[PDB]
Amino acid sequence: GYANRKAIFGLQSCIVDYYRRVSIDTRLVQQLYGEDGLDARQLETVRF
Amino acid sequence: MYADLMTRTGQVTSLEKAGLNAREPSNVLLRMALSSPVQVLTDAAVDSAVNPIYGIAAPTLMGSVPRIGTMYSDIIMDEKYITENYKS
Amino acid sequence: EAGYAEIAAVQFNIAGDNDHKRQGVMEVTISNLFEGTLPAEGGIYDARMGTTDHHYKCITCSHQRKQCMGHPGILQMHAPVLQPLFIAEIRRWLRVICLNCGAPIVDLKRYEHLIRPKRLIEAASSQTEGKQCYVCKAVHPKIVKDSEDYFTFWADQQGKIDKLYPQIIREIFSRVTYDTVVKLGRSKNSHPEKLVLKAIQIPPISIRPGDINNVIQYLVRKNLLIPKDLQIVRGQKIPLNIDRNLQTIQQLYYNFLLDSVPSIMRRLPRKEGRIRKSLLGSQVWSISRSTICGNSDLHLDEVGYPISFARTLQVAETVQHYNINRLMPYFLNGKRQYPGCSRVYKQITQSVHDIEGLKQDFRLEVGDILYRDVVTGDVAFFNRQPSLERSSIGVHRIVVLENPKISTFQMNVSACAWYNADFDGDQMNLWVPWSVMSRVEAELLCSVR
Amino acid sequence: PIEAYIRQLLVDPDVVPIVSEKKKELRVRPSTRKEIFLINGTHLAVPAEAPIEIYGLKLRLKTFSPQCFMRMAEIGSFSPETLGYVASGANLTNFIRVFMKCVDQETWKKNGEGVVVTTKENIIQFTHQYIELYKFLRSGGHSWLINRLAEEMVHRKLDREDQGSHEEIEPEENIKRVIFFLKELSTMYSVSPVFTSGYMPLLYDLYRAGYLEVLWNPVEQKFLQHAEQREKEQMILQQVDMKLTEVITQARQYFKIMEEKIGRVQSDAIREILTMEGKVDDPNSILQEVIKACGKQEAELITTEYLNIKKQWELQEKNACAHLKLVKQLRSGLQYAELLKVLESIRVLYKEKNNTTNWNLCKACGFKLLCPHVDMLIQLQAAEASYDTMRTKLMKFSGINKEKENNQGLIYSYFCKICGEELAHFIQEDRTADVGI
Amino acid sequence: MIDQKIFETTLNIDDPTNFCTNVEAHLLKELENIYVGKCFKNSFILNITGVIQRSPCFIMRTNNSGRGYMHVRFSAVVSYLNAFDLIAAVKIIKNDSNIILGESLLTEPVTIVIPSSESQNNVAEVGQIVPVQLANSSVYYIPGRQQASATGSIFIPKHTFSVYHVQEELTQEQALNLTKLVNIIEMLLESRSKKDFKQICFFEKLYYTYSISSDEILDLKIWKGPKGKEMSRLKPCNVLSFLYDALKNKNSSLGFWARPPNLLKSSPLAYQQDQNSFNATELPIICSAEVMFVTLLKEIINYLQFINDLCDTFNNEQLIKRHENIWMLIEQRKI
Amino acid sequence: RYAVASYGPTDALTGQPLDGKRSHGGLRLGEMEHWVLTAQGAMQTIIEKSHDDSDGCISYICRNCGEPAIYNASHPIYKCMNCDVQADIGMVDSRRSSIVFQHEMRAANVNITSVLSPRVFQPA
Amino acid sequence: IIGKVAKIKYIDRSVMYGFDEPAVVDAVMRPHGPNDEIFGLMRLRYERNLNIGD
Amino acid sequence: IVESPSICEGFVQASSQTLVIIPDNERITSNVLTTFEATRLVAVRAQQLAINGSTMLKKKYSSPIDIAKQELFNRKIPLLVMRCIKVTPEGQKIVEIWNPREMGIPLLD
Ligand SMILES: [Zn+2]
Ligand SMILES: [Zn+2]
Ligand SMILES: [Zn+2]
Ligand SMILES: [Zn+2]
């Protein structure tokens, strides 16, 4: 709980904007969310 | 998300009070909630700090709700569609 | 007449005498509490600062207890008092300016290259004792902090000791120009003159319902003792009774604000503090808790919910032309059958009506709000603490258990993986949305699927 | 009325500071702290009251920007004196620069522009010009002019951003037949076809319909039949549910009228027999009451009286009487002094003074007009009544007493016995006046 | 005065669907319901002329009501009352042992607080109407009120005046601006001309600074009124045609300008000189022509409106002779 | 087991329900539950629970100066004791615990001015 | 369960049974406390069987 | 010399903004409603139906939620989605206006 609360209060300001970037109210944290722009719930494990 | 946040300023910031003060110096209300409101509030007053409202803690501490998810995109009334289609 | 608005930014500043004089709605002049069953006007309980009872209204906003947020007052101190939060700041301003002409002693241009937050700190960090002022020819004494309290300051001129009373501190700080403040990093709103108060702000009644009132009453009573026309100049000897009275006033104010940080600032910090218990957390109505149980006949997106709890929690349905026929059987059952209803809101009277005291209506009026009982098929938020994952709060379809002897929240065993739950004695919260907006979003976003 | 006090109230604004010398004849004291200059040009300040000699005076010609004046006009709630002050500062007007320029000569020099006067009588002239300048800024003149020019410049800006400022063609044959399928399905499922270039809303519609096989497999007709079937069962179930719920409503109305007529004991007994029959909420309670405990006529009158209440409720729905709208203006709060006269205009329509136990009736139409506790509540609200003094007075209108011990639901509020409206609420006694003096 | 203004506000729309059917009609109706007849933003709104700009009908974000709001920028005709202004219709409402309150019956709803410490206003009668002179204080415009709060006193003509030393003249734009003032002058002057001369001259003679026993019908072919005293060999100059020719740039406006008590105030004429022959007890006010022109034209506007309101209110001999103790006090203070 | 009501006993200071079953108050939607609801995007649920069901109220803030104002539809009050002539009051959806929080900071000689969101207009 | 009024006419500081499950009054007595004064002591009994959730 | 504060500085009220609508052909945001936006649209429409109840849906349903969902699915919802892109220091507010009657609905029914 000590580590969980500190992690959230530092990370919670990160919100995906209309460019799928991750930013803090103006300031880019990621140029693209996850560098692929996808959701974790919508991933398939596929062999190449 | 951890690495990109901790390394967005060119230096490895932390997930503690010192790290938050570097990434987000002007977000007093979020900084007040984390560790010690009295110390942050005193420093904000002398510095004449201006706190924009964003994220979660800042809207929450002011009694509002964060602009996230369903609240991110606001909804406007379709003026043109109603006039031709609806009646008073 | 008041339009809709949102807060875009918040500005933090130091509150001076002018701010307190403007924002205050009344001036405290007496130490009496109540003149009978009403608060005494001019006291610390005056109704112009708000109301907390049903026995009287707020004189200012003319609202009841619920709709009045409180308004601040003014207490004109007979002698100046230092600001408890910014005492350290005062010390900084006592180590940079001359105490006889006000001009800066350190060279401002030597701190031009610094960022404005740290200019004053790194300018006052260096020793300034003994430096000779360039415009009045005065030697700067050393500002030593009294070790026995958090506010008293002494000036030492090579063994000549003096006590810097708050009036002397005000007279020293008021002689400082805004150019010095700006070139030292601080903004125009952070002028040192605001660091000494002569008109403190009495917090509104909504902040102190009903110990803090005792501290304020003590402060007012002991402030009345100080002569109103008391004058303090540097180097003047003071009678010991007046000195100890000023000590008591300042200590009372400091303990009113920073008592070992009952005080105002003690309400903020910890888990049971203002921020983490009243703002980041919340106590809510229309919520239920019970021990969870296993039920293999329920779907993974269904929760078994007792009928007794179903008749306590309600769902707000607005009466229109499309649901007049469906909601009508709920109306006729009332609190005597299930499913029924317990409470009706009417647009005609803009008020709230019971269902047992209202049985003379054939049907409902369009626009009314019906608070019906929870039925099978309703969606509900279902939560287990601690909430570590975002699947810890999920929306399940309610299956109402008609057995009156069942008091547990039953769910499929395969649904425990969402909440990291088991049936060794865990308890889980459950609240049924009633607002249409929250009920829509439960079905579309928060569904456990 | 000596010169000293005039120079003293000159000190009040941040403009016109003081140059001070130890060897002069003038002597005035300020009302608050004042930032001052000196010969040898040192910038100092003085406390609220302190004897300061006057070598001379300097009014600064502060230069603002037109953007500040535009921002104030956007706020549009400033006194004409401040607007004119800034307009003269922002070179939008030429008033302060005219009332000044009484300079004896450029006898002193610093950073900012300004008028400098260091004499014995030209300082008097400076004071007279300053007083007359603010007299003009406060008078009827300069108030028409500045307000008019601010309105004109705002209107011109609105014109600048108002008047001076401000493609698919054909789908493919595969998507042509898919959009034909969607067009035929629109009258059959919750789908409306659009003509976007990216084909994407069509893809979501097909995915949502659970049938994406149109794109490659020409088997659309079986899904059309499937949609027709599903719509058919949907309509059948909807109509069955509507019939069931109207039957339930009519049966509950019948039983409620039975309860109000023949009493709780007989009604609950009939509920008991129907409960151990599986036929509750079905209008065979009519037959049960016919052959049980009474005659067929006493149930015939129940049916006719049900129809009578239905007709009366329909007539009440048809009501368009004046009093109704008046009641709305009584239930909006809105300036107690006006709701008091609204209540005055409503009380003329009463019939028998209707003190207690029943509704007031409208003589103009005949239906219910206003419950008495509402009248008393309005009187108290207009009569500066506190909540406690309002909760206790509305206690003769209290609802059902210990007749009902409880309805298994914990309630903290009283209700009116005449209509059921919530009178007030009580949770705990305040008990804060216990500390008296 | 009565002048145009622009306001910004936010309106709450309870039912957005019905509102959006006729947005302009609903917006004008709601603005008229909310703001017409009230004091807001240091002014008293009389009419809502129109809406210049508006926002899309947003949906409120911070609550679950589904209600809407709209930002409206609208142009409205409002009234701003200045200091030292003339109101010729002030009916006394409250005359107690503490304070005197009167109400105006003109297009500027204003309550007048008359201090009951001067011999002029100490004795009056409740229900009597009287012209009122406003003091040198700002008119209070408390938001949400149906009236403007302002102090005032019964108008006694004064014996003093002012002299303006003008050294800088007009330009083309600075005279096109005063064209609006001269338009107001000519409108008020036509209003004067469309009414019978008997009460005009009665009121003008009674509010002359000195005693006018002789009768004269002085004419300028544009303004008509009784002639009074002169000042030796000095001949007035009509400020209206003076400003017209100054706009035509065939005249110089520099010098000393004065409006002495003996001068016909409501007339467009005033005194100009190359050197002060006036026996003024106040120092000349150094200034340009903008301030003197605007002040003189505003004074002419005020006195013309005062006379017009006096003649509008007092229609017959009964009204004028009912209040003749005020008028008696008026003659008692003239030279 | 517990299930209380739509209303009941209320805290005097914060305006929130009391604590737990023993006081007949409500149950706590704590810090970790607002994290989950924000993560899920459930914002209208937060309004229903943290505002409608706990302490939500209406706060009036003057636009011209950012200080709290005084508004009352009945017994018309439209005033602001910092500017008093140029008040432009706008209502903001807040909660009583936040207003109490802001007043406590002002009691500590910290000025709290709220900058309301500016008006937005079409360019037509 | 316990009637109690404070004389001001009267204000009712009564004690109400706020529990969902009904109880049975088992013992009622009026002892004297350490300050030699009457206080009310009531014992409520619940017939508890084993039910779902225990 | 940096002098005493004036009236030009110290304004609390932010200046008004001008809504700059990006033209349709120059839009960058997706032509597909997100689940958040679709949920917000359905909730707003359901609440407004609970207020007004006037709808042009040909089918009949006994709940505002169902009517709002069918209105969104049948592309007959009287709402627009405004996607705030950027607030410019000079005053402009660049936004994107999207019509939910011509975007792909992510919901399922
Ligand atoms: Zn209040
Ligand atoms: Zn010095
Ligand atoms: Zn009627
Ligand atoms: Zn204000």
JSON list of N, CA and C in Angstrom, two decimals, chain D residues 63-74 86-87 89-92 153 157:
[
{"chain": "D", "resi": 63, "resn": "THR", "atom": "N", "xyz": [2.63, 54.07, -19.12]},
{"chain": "D", "resi": 63, "resn": "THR", "atom": "CA", "xyz": [2.21, 53.68, -20.45]},
{"chain": "D", "resi": 63, "resn": "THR", "atom": "C", "xyz": [1.69, 52.25, -20.42]},
{"chain": "D", "resi": 64, "resn": "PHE", "atom": "N", "xyz": [0.38, 52.09, -20.54]},
{"chain": "D", "resi": 64, "resn": "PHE", "atom": "CA", "xyz": [-0.25, 50.78, -20.61]},
{"chain": "D", "resi": 64, "resn": "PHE", "atom": "C", "xyz": [-0.32, 50.33, -22.07]},
{"chain": "D", "resi": 65, "resn": "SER", "atom": "N", "xyz": [-1.01, 49.22, -22.31]},
{"chain": "D", "resi": 65, "resn": "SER", "atom": "CA", "xyz": [-1.24, 48.73, -23.65]},
{"chain": "D", "resi": 65, "resn": "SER", "atom": "C", "xyz": [-2.73, 48.73, -23.97]},
{"chain": "D", "resi": 66, "resn": "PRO", "atom": "N", "xyz": [-3.11, 48.87, -25.24]},
{"chain": "D", "resi": 66, "resn": "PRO", "atom": "CA", "xyz": [-4.54, 48.79, -25.59]},
{"chain": "D", "resi": 66, "resn": "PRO", "atom": "C", "xyz": [-5.16, 47.45, -25.24]},
{"chain": "D", "resi": 67, "resn": "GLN", "atom": "N", "xyz": [-4.35, 46.40, -25.12]},
{"chain": "D", "resi": 67, "resn": "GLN", "atom": "CA", "xyz": [-4.88, 45.09, -24.74]},
{"chain": "D", "resi": 67, "resn": "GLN", "atom": "C", "xyz": [-5.48, 45.11, -23.34]},
{"chain": "D", "resi": 68, "resn": "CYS", "atom": "N", "xyz": [-4.89, 45.87, -22.42]},
{"chain": "D", "resi": 68, "resn": "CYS", "atom": "CA", "xyz": [-5.45, 45.99, -21.08]},
{"chain": "D", "resi": 68, "resn": "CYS", "atom": "C", "xyz": [-6.83, 46.65, -21.12]},
{"chain": "D", "resi": 69, "resn": "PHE", "atom": "N", "xyz": [-6.96, 47.71, -21.91]},
{"chain": "D", "resi": 69, "resn": "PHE", "atom": "CA", "xyz": [-8.25, 48.38, -22.03]},
{"chain": "D", "resi": 69, "resn": "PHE", "atom": "C", "xyz": [-9.28, 47.47, -22.68]},
{"chain": "D", "resi": 70, "resn": "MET", "atom": "N", "xyz": [-8.87, 46.70, -23.69]},
{"chain": "D", "resi": 70, "resn": "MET", "atom": "CA", "xyz": [-9.77, 45.73, -24.30]},
{"chain": "D", "resi": 70, "resn": "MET", "atom": "C", "xyz": [-10.19, 44.66, -23.30]},
{"chain": "D", "resi": 71, "resn": "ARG", "atom": "N", "xyz": [-9.27, 44.22, -22.44]},
{"chain": "D", "resi": 71, "resn": "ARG", "atom": "CA", "xyz": [-9.62, 43.22, -21.44]},
{"chain": "D", "resi": 71, "resn": "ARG", "atom": "C", "xyz": [-10.62, 43.78, -20.43]},
{"chain": "D", "resi": 72, "resn": "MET", "atom": "N", "xyz": [-10.43, 45.02, -19.99]},
{"chain": "D", "resi": 72, "resn": "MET", "atom": "CA", "xyz": [-11.40, 45.62, -19.07]},
{"chain": "D", "resi": 72, "resn": "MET", "atom": "C", "xyz": [-12.75, 45.80, -19.74]},
{"chain": "D", "resi": 73, "resn": "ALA", "atom": "N", "xyz": [-12.77, 46.22, -21.00]},
{"chain": "D", "resi": 73, "resn": "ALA", "atom": "CA", "xyz": [-14.03, 46.35, -21.72]},
{"chain": "D", "resi": 73, "resn": "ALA", "atom": "C", "xyz": [-14.70, 45.00, -21.91]},
{"chain": "D", "resi": 74, "resn": "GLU", "atom": "N", "xyz": [-13.91, 43.94, -22.08]},
{"chain": "D", "resi": 74, "resn": "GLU", "atom": "CA", "xyz": [-14.45, 42.59, -22.08]},
{"chain": "D", "resi": 74, "resn": "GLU", "atom": "C", "xyz": [-15.09, 42.26, -20.74]},
{"chain": "D", "resi": 86, "resn": "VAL", "atom": "N", "xyz": [-6.66, 54.29, -17.67]},
{"chain": "D", "resi": 86, "resn": "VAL", "atom": "CA", "xyz": [-5.89, 53.35, -18.48]},
{"chain": "D", "resi": 86, "resn": "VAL", "atom": "C", "xyz": [-5.84, 53.80, -19.94]},
{"chain": "D", "resi": 87, "resn": "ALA", "atom": "N", "xyz": [-6.94, 54.33, -20.46]},
{"chain": "D", "resi": 87, "resn": "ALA", "atom": "CA", "xyz": [-6.97, 54.79, -21.85]},
{"chain": "D", "resi": 87, "resn": "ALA", "atom": "C", "xyz": [-5.96, 55.91, -22.08]},
{"chain": "D", "resi": 89, "resn": "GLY", "atom": "N", "xyz": [-3.32, 56.22, -20.21]},
{"chain": "D", "resi": 89, "resn": "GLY", "atom": "CA", "xyz": [-2.05, 55.51, -20.11]},
{"chain": "D", "resi": 89, "resn": "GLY", "atom": "C", "xyz": [-1.70, 54.75, -21.37]},
{"chain": "D", "resi": 90, "resn": "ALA", "atom": "N", "xyz": [-2.68, 54.12, -22.00]},
{"chain": "D", "resi": 90, "resn": "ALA", "atom": "CA", "xyz": [-2.46, 53.29, -23.18]},
{"chain": "D", "resi": 90, "resn": "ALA", "atom": "C", "xyz": [-2.51, 54.09, -24.48]},
{"chain": "D", "resi": 91, "resn": "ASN", "atom": "N", "xyz": [-2.33, 55.41, -24.41]},
{"chain": "D", "resi": 91, "resn": "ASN", "atom": "CA", "xyz": [-2.31, 56.30, -25.58]},
{"chain": "D", "resi": 91, "resn": "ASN", "atom": "C", "xyz": [-3.62, 56.27, -26.37]},
{"chain": "D", "resi": 92, "resn": "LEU", "atom": "N", "xyz": [-4.68, 55.71, -25.79]},
{"chain": "D", "resi": 92, "resn": "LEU", "atom": "CA", "xyz": [-5.99, 55.72, -26.44]},
{"chain": "D", "resi": 92, "resn": "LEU", "atom": "C", "xyz": [-6.71, 57.05, -26.27]},
{"chain": "D", "resi": 153, "resn": "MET", "atom": "N", "xyz": [-15.04, 50.07, -29.73]},
{"chain": "D", "resi": 153, "resn": "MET", "atom": "CA", "xyz": [-13.88, 49.24, -30.01]},
{"chain": "D", "resi": 153, "resn": "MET", "atom": "C", "xyz": [-14.20, 47.76, -29.81]},
{"chain": "D", "resi": 157, "resn": "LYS", "atom": "N", "xyz": [-13.99, 44.99, -32.74]},
{"chain": "D", "resi": 157, "resn": "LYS", "atom": "CA", "xyz": [-13.31, 43.70, -32.58]},
{"chain": "D", "resi": 157, "resn": "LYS", "atom": "C", "xyz": [-14.23, 42.54, -32.94]}
]
